[PDB]
Design a protein around this ligand. Structure first.
Ligand SMILES: CCCCCCCCCCCCCCCCCC(=O)OC[C@H](COP(=O)([O-])OCC(O)COP(=O)([O-])OC[C@@H](COC(=O)CCCCCCCCCCCCCCCCC)OC(=O)CCCCCCCCCCCCCCCCC)OC(=O)CCCCCCCCCCCCCCCCC
Ligand SMILES: COC1=C(OC)C(=O)C(C/C=C(\C)CC/C=C(\C)CC/C=C(/C)CC/C=C(/C)CC/C=C(\C)CC/C=C(\C)CC/C=C(\C)CC/C=C(\C)CC/C=C(\C)CCC=C(C)C)=C(C)C1=O
Ligand SMILES: CCCCCCCCCCCCCCCCCC(=O)OC[C@H](COP(=O)([O-])OCC[N+](C)(C)C)OC(=O)CCCCCCCCCCCCCCCCC
Ligand code: SF4
Lengths: 155, 70, 175, 318, 98, 83, 115, 57
């Protein structure tokens, strides 16, 4: 059946996507320190296929770790627009989610959402390195439930 | 532990083993068992060409011993 | 089709020769030389010159590398040219391709070309000679005799290249 | 039976680099107390396939300021050069019995650098041109030592034929007669392939990219697979040239097993040094070769021209 | 005198023509200069190999030894003309008209 | 002695590579004249028969030239076997 | 034959991988995804203006030194001669001038990289 | 109470200079760095199997 063939093919692509996420570190504030602890051998982010890779031309997901200051807000959008785009954005910490501690400041945007679309939200201040691992695991589940080929077959 | 590293080597070592075995066996298969004659100099090539003419079947590796003459 | 690769290889040599002689941007000129240089190595290899073929391959590649390594260093144009770019380079280019393609047509259709010298099309496989080479390649022993029969050439070449490093620093030093 | 032979080389080669990326992280992790990929398949035995399949399905894009033609051909240059270079390697019997196999590999390996800056120049990026200009003078200066080291060692061969190394080091490993040249040969191989005492070509710490600046799924995969293939060979070339092995003419499989083992051990050392040393600054890596490697290089050369003459051990030319 | 001789002789002519028509670049000019060297090296190699002039097989080598020696001289001269005048188009060095 | 020994020791400390390279470079030139096997290397190269030993017509009065390859007279290279 | 077939197969294999590289992954691109990468903020306008490096002197001596290695390449077949004394003297002679050129290049600033 | 971290002057005797020269040519501190990376390779990785092995709180 055509639907079955597109079903297996979609799963193959989705497996290839979720099993290789290459974060482009936007290390901004104390949320970045905890994320490096995820890369530390205690949790070993690398072991899940997900390994840190620079050059957003060669990265799949953004991990917004820290406050997003209005001065650098154009930089966040520019590095987001340059990713080969099967692409997702992970927001770490209360500050990146909706402003957090500095929600009422004059120079902190109330959440990274106002600049970029945001996938799974990671709450914390900072979210423990284990909590982020759960977040990345959630994105892998979200990638697993992608029906890109099924929608194309039913267009 | 470190022994978990070995599966990474094994699937590579076998893969790297194939070109050595394939080339060695293909030469033997395509030359009737004997290794492919190497001609680094014109004199070696002259022997090979005379082998092709003498064999009759236009095969250099097909060799005729004493029984060809009588 | 495998009749004789000498003309086919030499043709790409000329077309590559046409390229950088049309004055592109210098970096694209390096590519035009390299294809001619690489296929030129192929021509000499086909003629038995195995060592000399790879010899011009290794030296030139290093030679032209520092060539277009220099062009991007201080000879680059803020808006570089290309094979199409300006009509002058476009005109200089297409002139070369139509020229050579005319001569080969003039070459392969009567086989009695008489431009400057005489050129008759009968096959470069013909000029080969029948005979063995013993257990040594003739070219390798010829260039090996440089240290036995060419002690005079070694002296003048070695001294000139040593002077070559002196001039290069002396010219480039300045002030 | 030649297309089968060629495809019995291309597929194993691309699969060798394929799982070298797995034995990289799984070795790098274990040396930094991590565990490496062990999720995708058992012990990570499927991670590179997951990596590769993603890197041929995620959106590729040429830079807006790129030069399309040179941008596309550079991955062609890198991959074809890497594959074509394995051709004269004398695993028992070489695939192509070149009379001048050594000179061939020197010439094409000197060509694998046209890919790196044609990619850099066409990308029209500030980090691209910097990385391109870093790499070219890096390789060619390291190439002068590469040529002389090969010549000095091969003076005991009597020829440039790769097959004769089997005969040359039949009883004694070549390293025991040229170990001083072996050290600089290994360092230069670390430098031509841009591993990480001198990975400044990538320069991720200071140049973020440079192997592949805006290069994406396909072209990034090539420029990776074109340099990891060089990693395996430059140790296979080191293995064949210095650490010979017994070769029974009737059972070549023993030599292939031994030859593969030496390449595997050498490749691990390439990964081993990669996570044990800092990054050489540009002037340092140039100073190391032009001011310390070359003086020893020429001196040991003169030794190896004279050595066969004083000991009456001129090797046979044939 | 087969057609391969025509190809490289006619090639050298375009190297001569290419050099003698400086359009806007010293670097591209030097390219045509080293271009000439290919045809001379290639033709010379074909000659002494065809004729089995074994002792003369060194001549293409000595050509190359003195080949890059000029090539180095050209770029070194190109270094200063571009350094102190900015670019390498051969038109801005006409101060010696008087 | 004092001037030379101080210089060699000082160079052995600051620039070990240069004093090293100048050593092997120095030895690479002066032993080959001293060593006695250089003449053997010439003899081995001379004794190698790349070309045919073209026969020379026997008009008599050539006692030293052999008539058969197994004849005792002629250049014998049994020294190669011993060496 | 054998060498050209191998050369052909490699370039077809490489080109096919490019073709599936740029066509199998479909594209949803715009003018901001094609912008040159400059670690975030806007580039000031560069990557084609004269970027003058400093190792030009040693870059060009490599070309001179690469010619030395071309001259001394035929050494393996040079040892198979009947006059090694002349061959040894000349072979060391080229090495000496190669060492001499490097030494004189060294002493006069030379390998030092301009500031 | 202060301590001078880097005020070590190497000895100039014939023994010490050779060891430094031996260290230079025959790369030793580089081998010591290599030799210790091998030591960590054979050790016990500290990775915890998330989410089957959650961290200690
Ligand atoms: C030597 C022969 C040189 C022939 C030539 O003109 O090369 C131009 C070629 C393209 O120049 P460019 O600076 O990339 O500009 C391309 C567009 O004009 C500018 O970019 P673009 O986005 O317009 O590129 C697409 C464009 C140009 O076409 C391409 O980009 C396709 C690939 C190049 C085709 C030529 O397509 C077309 O013009 C329509 C094609 C139908 O430049 C080269 O250096 C290629 C030489 C290839 C030689 C053979 C190599 C094997
Ligand atoms: C600073 O330092 C740095 C480095 O290091 C010094 C680095 O390393 C790295 C790299 C980073 C890391 C290692 C970190 C982790 C990242 C990764 C692991 C990235 C992984 C990247 C990959 C590319 C994945 C690689 C993995 C795999 C599994 C690749 C697998 C390969 C394949 C799927 C393809 C294999 C080949 C195939 C299938 C070939 C098939 C061929 C055929 C069918 C035949 C083709 C040929 C023919 C038919 C010929 C006949 C045809 C003819 C004649 C046609 C004729 C036509 C005419 C017109 C005439 C970085 C960034 C770095 O910063
Ligand atoms: C080796 C790999 C083997 C598996 C490869 C499967 C094919 C993956 C190709 C890339 C994803 C796009 C695809 O499959 O179809 C494109 C199709 C193209 O048609 P489409 O309309 O669905 O494209 C996406 C929607 N727009 C156009 C708005 C961007 O897209 C999808 O399937 C994605 C949904
Ligand atoms: S959410 Fe908390 S830990 Fe994260 S950046 Fe803001 S203040 Fe720092």
């Amino acid at each position: 059946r055509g639907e079955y063939v597109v079903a297996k093919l979609d799963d193959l692509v989705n497996w290839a996507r979720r099993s290789s996420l290459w974060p482009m570190t936007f290390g901004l504030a104390c949320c970045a320190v905890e994320m490096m602890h995820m890369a530390a051998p205690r949790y070993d982010m690398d072991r899940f296929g997900v390994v840190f890779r620079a050059s957003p031309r060669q990265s799949d997901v953004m991990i917004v770790a820290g406050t997003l200051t209005n001065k650098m807000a154009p930089a966040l959008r520019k590095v987001y627009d340059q990713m080969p785009e099967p692409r997702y954005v992970v927001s770490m910490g209360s500050c990146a989610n909706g402003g957090g501690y500095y929600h009422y400041s004059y120079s902190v945007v109330r959440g990274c959402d106002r600049i970029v679309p945001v996938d799974i939200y990671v709450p914390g201040c900072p979210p423990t390195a284990e909590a982020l691992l759960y977040g990345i695991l959630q994105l892998q589940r979200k990638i697993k439930r992608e029906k890109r080929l099924r929608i194309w077959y039913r267009r | 532990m470190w022994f978990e590293i070995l599966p990474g080597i094994a699937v590579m070592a076998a893969c790297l083993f194939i070109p050595g075995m394939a080339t060695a066996h293909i030469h033997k298969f395509t030359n009737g068992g004997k290794e492919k004659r190497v001609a680094h100099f014109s004199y070696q090539w002259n022997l090979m060409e005379r082998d092709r003419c003498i064999s009759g079947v236009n095969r250099y590796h097909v060799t005729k011993g004493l029984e060809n003459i009588d | 089709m495998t009749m004789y690769i000498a003309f086919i290889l030499s043709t790409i040599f000329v077309i590559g020769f046409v390229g950088f002689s049309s004055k592109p941007s210098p970096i694209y000129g390096g590519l035009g030389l390299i294809v001619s240089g690489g296929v030129g190595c192929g021509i000499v290899l086909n003629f038995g010159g195995s060592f000399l073929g790879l010899m011009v391959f290794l030296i030139y590649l290093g030679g032209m590398l520092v060539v277009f390594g220099y062009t991007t260093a201080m000879a680059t144009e803020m808006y570089p040219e290309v094979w199409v770019s300006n009509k002058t380079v476009f005109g200089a280019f297409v002139s070369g391709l139509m020229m050579e393609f005319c001569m080969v047509y003039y070459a392969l259709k009567e086989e009695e070309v008489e431009i400057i010298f005489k050129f008759n099309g009968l096959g470069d496989w013909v000029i080969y000679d029948t005979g063995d080479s013993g257990f040594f390649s003739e070219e390798a022993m010829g260039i090996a005799a440089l240290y036995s029969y060419g002690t005079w050439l070694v002296i003048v070449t070695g001294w000139s290249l040593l002077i070559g490093v002196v001039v290069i620093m002396e010219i480039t030093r300045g002030n | 039976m030649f297309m089968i032979n060629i495809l019995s080389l291309i597929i194993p080669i691309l699969l060798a680099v394929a799982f070298l990326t797995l034995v990289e992280r799984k070795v790098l992790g274990y040396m930094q107390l991590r565990k490496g990929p062990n999720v995708v398949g058992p012990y990570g035995l499927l991670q590179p396939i997951a990596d590769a399949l993603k890197l041929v399905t995620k959106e590729p894009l040429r830079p807006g300021t790129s030069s399309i033609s040179m941008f596309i051909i550079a991955p062609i240059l890198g991959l074809s050069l890497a594959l074509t270079m394995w051709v004269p390697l004398p695993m028992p019997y070489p695939l192509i019995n070149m009379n001048l196999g050594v000179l061939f590999m020197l010439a094409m390996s000197s060509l694998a650098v046209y890919s790196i800056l044609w990619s850099g120049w066409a990308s029209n990026s500030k980090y691209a041109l910097i990385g391109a200009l870093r790499a070219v003078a890096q390789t060619i200066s390291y190439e002068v030592t590469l040529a002389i080291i090969l010549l000095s060692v091969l003076l005991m061969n009597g020829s440039y034929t790769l097959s004769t190394l089997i005969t040359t080091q039949e009883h004694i490993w070549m390293i025991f007669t040229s170990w001083p040249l072996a050290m600089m040969w290994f360092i230069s191989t670390l430098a031509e392939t841009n591993r990480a005492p001198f990975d400044l070509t990538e320069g991720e710490s200071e140049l973020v990219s440079g192997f592949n600046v805006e290069y994406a799924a396909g072209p990034f995969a090539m420029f990776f697979m074109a340099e990891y293939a060089n990693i395996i060979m430059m140790n296979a070339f080191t293995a064949i040239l210095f650490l010979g092995a017994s070769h029974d003419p009737h059972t070549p499989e023993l030599y292939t097993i031994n030859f593969v083992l030496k390449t595997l051990a050498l490749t691990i050392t390439f990964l081993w040094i990669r996570a044990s040393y800092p990054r050489f600054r540009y002037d340092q890596l140039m100073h190391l070769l032009w001011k310390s490697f070359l003086p020893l290089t020429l001196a040991l050369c003169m030794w190896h021209i004279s050595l066969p003459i004083m000991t009456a051990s001129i090797p046979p030319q044939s | 005198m087969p057609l391969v001789y025509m190809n490289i002789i006619m090639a050298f002519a375009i190297a001569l023509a290419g050099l003698l028509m400086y359009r806007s670049h010293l670097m591209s000019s030097l390219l045509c200069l080293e271009g000439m060297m290919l045809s001379l090296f290639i033709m010379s190699t074909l000659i002494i190999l065809n004729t089995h002039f074994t002792l003369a097989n060194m001549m293409p080598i000595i050509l190359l030894v003195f080949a890059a020696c000029e090539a180095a001289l050209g770029l070194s001269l190109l270094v200063m003309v571009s350094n102190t005048y900015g670019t390498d188009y051969v038109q801005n060095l006409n101060l010696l008209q008087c | 002695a004092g001037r030379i020994a101080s210089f060699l020791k000082n160079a052995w400390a600051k620039e070990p590579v240069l004093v090293a390279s100048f050593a092997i470079g120095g030895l690479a030139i002066i032993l080959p004249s001293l060593s006695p096997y250089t003449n053997y290397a010439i003899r081995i190269n001379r004794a190698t028969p790349y070309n045919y030993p073209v026969p020379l017509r026997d008009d008599g009065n050539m006692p030293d030239v052999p008539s058969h390859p197994q004849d005792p007279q002629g250049p014998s290279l049994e020294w190669l076997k011993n060496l | 034959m054998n060498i050209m077939l191998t050369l052909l197969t490699n370039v077809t294999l490489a080109s096919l991988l490019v073709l599936i590289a740029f066509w199998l992954p479909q594209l949803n691109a715009y003018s901001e995804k094609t912008s040159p990468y400059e670690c975030g903020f806007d580039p000031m306008g560069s990557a084609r203006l004269p970027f003058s490096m400093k190792f030009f002197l040693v870059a060009i001596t490599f070309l001179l030194f690469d010619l030395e290695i071309a001259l001394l390449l035929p050494l393996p077949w040079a040892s198979q001669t009947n006059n090694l004394k002349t061959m040894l003297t000349m072979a060391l002679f080229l090495l000496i001038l190669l060492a001499a050129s490097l030494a004189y290049e060294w002493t006069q600033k030379g390998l030092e990289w301009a500031e | 109470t202060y301590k001078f971290v880097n005020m070590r002057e190497p000895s100039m005797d014939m023994k010490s200079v050779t060891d430094r020269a031996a260290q230079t040519l025959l790369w030793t501190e580089l081998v010591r760095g290599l030799g210790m990376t091998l030591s960590y390779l054979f050790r016990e990785p500290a990775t915890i199997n998330y989410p089957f092995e959650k961290g200690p709180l």
